A paper describes a structure:
Employing techniques such as crystallography, computational analysis, mutagenesis, and activity assays, we identified a His-His-Asp (HHD) motif in the active sites of the two enzymes, which is crucial for binding a catalytically active calcium ion.
Conservative asparagine replacements in the HHD motif resulted in [name] variants that remained active. CysGfl-D191N showed a 56% decrease in substrate turnover, while CysGfl-H122N and CysGfl-H123N were fully active compared to wt but were inactivated with EDTA.
Author numbering: 16 to 229
The structure:
Amino acid sequence: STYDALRRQLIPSFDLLYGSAVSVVAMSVPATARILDLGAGTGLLGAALRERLPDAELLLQDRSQAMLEQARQRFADDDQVAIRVADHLDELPAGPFDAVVSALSINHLEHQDKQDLFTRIRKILRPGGIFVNVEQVLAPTSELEKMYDRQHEAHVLASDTPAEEWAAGRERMKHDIPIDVETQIQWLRDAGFTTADCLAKDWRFATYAGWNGS
Ligand SMILES: Nc1ncnc2c1ncn2[C@@H]1O[C@H](CSCC[C@H](N)C(=O)O)[C@@H](O)[C@H]1O
């Protein structure tokens, strides 16, 4: 409620970017899809997926028990949601999966571990399966990165975000290892995804996807 409201204040085009992730999954997988949610946190993208796909099986995983406890509370009464404590770097669940989704999590990995993860994700996707990332992305240059930062700050100020939460936000972003969206899209092609695309973008934040065969 307050947490979800705060995420909208901190994330430019939250509805467009998380909404695009939901819409592209809904147009790519069945009603009864098996979906892996990597770095699920409180399960915010999971909640948006459940609203669109009431019959989908969600497996939420994260390295943080504390974050997954928030996801457990959110989905307390949902018998089609499982929770697994697992780092991105730990062995993935067997599969197959119709979709693997992630929001604002994969940027925390070293670049080589991102490329390895994309390869490992495709292995657990059925043919026609989709990988979707709602991601913090780096500008191609230092000058454009400053412009990305100004536009992010403009949203946070316009959204009337508490100064203490924005302060906390900037501190958490120090541990992020973002790269530009086109590099990551090319990495999906390198990983053997036949199609990769940026569906939606608001400067620093982008929704991109890869398809396993289609
Ligand atoms: N190496 C790693 N393996 C697994 N989870 C990781 C991780 N590095 C970061 N995370 C998780 O990634 C999340 C980033 S915050 C995003 C949370 C949620 N997907 C949302 O959109 O709101 C946190 O829950 C953090 O614990």
